[PDB]
Structure formats: C-alpha cells, structure tokens
Amino acid sequence: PNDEEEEEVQLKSARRATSMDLPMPMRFRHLKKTSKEAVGVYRSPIHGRGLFCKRNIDAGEMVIEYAGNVIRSIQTDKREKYYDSKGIGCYMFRIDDSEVVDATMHGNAARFINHSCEPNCYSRVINIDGQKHIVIFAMRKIYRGEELTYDYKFKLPCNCGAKKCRKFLN
Ligand SMILES: Nc1ncnc2c1ncn2[C@@H]1O[C@H](CSCC[C@H](N)C(=O)O)[C@@H](O)[C@H]1O
Ligand SMILES: [Zn+2]
C-alpha cells in the first residue's frame, strides 16, 4: 500500500505566517484576515467587554493590530473634547511622545483588550511600507476561550484575576 506512497510529498498542518519566524512585513500581510479568525469580543469577568481567543494562538504570534488613524500628539486634547461633546467613546494608544493611534472612529476589536497585572499579550510598533502600526503579540500559547490581556502600565481599582495583582490600574 505504501508502495505508490514511497515518493509522495508528506503533508502536515500548515503554519500560519502570523506565527512564523519571518520578517515583520511578511507576518503583518495577512494579519487582518487571520485576526478575525483568532479573536472575538465577548463579555468579560474583568470589565465590561473583553477580547477572547476563538482558536489557539501560538507563543510569539501576531494577534491583532491596534487599528486606527495615526495623529499628532498635539491633536489629542481637542479630539477628546470633540468626542466628549458628541457622546463618542474615545480610544487612543500612544505610539511615542509625538504620535498616537486614534481608534475612536476607525478602530477594531483591539480596543476591547482589558488590563491585567499578569498579561498574556504585549505590544510593538512596526513600520510597514512607510506606515506605523501598533501590533499585539502573544507572550505565550493562548487557548480557545482565554481572555487576552495587556499591562496598561499607567488611583482606580484593578479587577484582573492575577495572584500578583497590583490592586490599582494607576
Ligand atoms: N483590569 C481592569 N480592572 C478594572 N477595569 C478595567 C480593567 N481593564 C480594563 N478596564 C476598563 O476598561 C477600560 C479600557 S477599554 C477596554 C475594554 C472595556 N473593558 C470595555 O468594555 O469597553 C479602562 O479604562 C477601564 O475602565
Ligand atoms: Zn491587577
């Protein structure tokens, strides 16, 4: 039976590019589509709504982009004011002292990532084709059903599960 099979190509599960040891732009290229399969927003025991794993995520894998428009740091106060006056919930992520991502109007599911003192995700800024993106990566293998969390690293109380909880977000 294995006779015709002696020369056949052996097959196995394909590894996702988001999870492979490739240069960042190759990894980032299919992040949008892959992220939709990997994570979803559900109610969270930590706070309100959270981001959850729908399909196992590899350690070190690109999980999702913190999507939004890159804006100058000095446009930030005015936009917050404007969102306030309109009854819009503001979501922003600082890139550095000069730039932030504004996810308020053109954001995605990454806005719903809760804080935890014992996180399973971390963030990086990457430049792809001249454009800055904030990308969330998994610190460890993450399994279907687990909540994805990040350390905000900012008083106001902390609701994370952590045994080493810091008790306050800030
Ligand atoms: N560990 C934590 N403990 C208490 N509140 C938290 C928290 N992590 C996130 N939050 C809340 O969520 C906000 C970040 S936006 C994250 C999504 C949010 N849970 C939502 O339902 O829309 C924080 O300002 C804080 O209000
Ligand atoms: Zn905590």
* CATH code (residue 132): 2.170.270.10
How many folded domains does the chain comprise? 1
Residue 121, domain member (yes or no): yes
Name every residue whose Cβ is closer than 8 Å to that of residue 54 and which is 6 or more positions away in sequence.
37, 38, 39, 40, 144
Q: Would you say 159 is a known binding-site residue?
A: yes
Nearest of 25, 100, 33 to residue 64 by alpha carbon: 33
Residue 9, domain member (yes or no): no
Q: Give the resolution in Å.
A: 2.0
Residue 8, domain member (yes or no): no
Which CA distances in Å does 1 have to 4, 5, 6, 150?
Answer: 7, 7, 9, 52
Token pair belonging to 163: 């045994």
Alpha-carbon span 67 to 133, nearest angstrom: 8
Residue 39, domain member (yes or no): yes
Token pair belonging to 66: 């913190």
Provide the domain limits for residue 71: 16-170
Alpha-carbon span 109 to 36, nearest angstrom: 9
Q: Would you say 66 is a known binding-site residue?
A: no
Residue 163 Cα to ligand 2 middle (Å) = 8
Residue 132, domain member (yes or no): yes
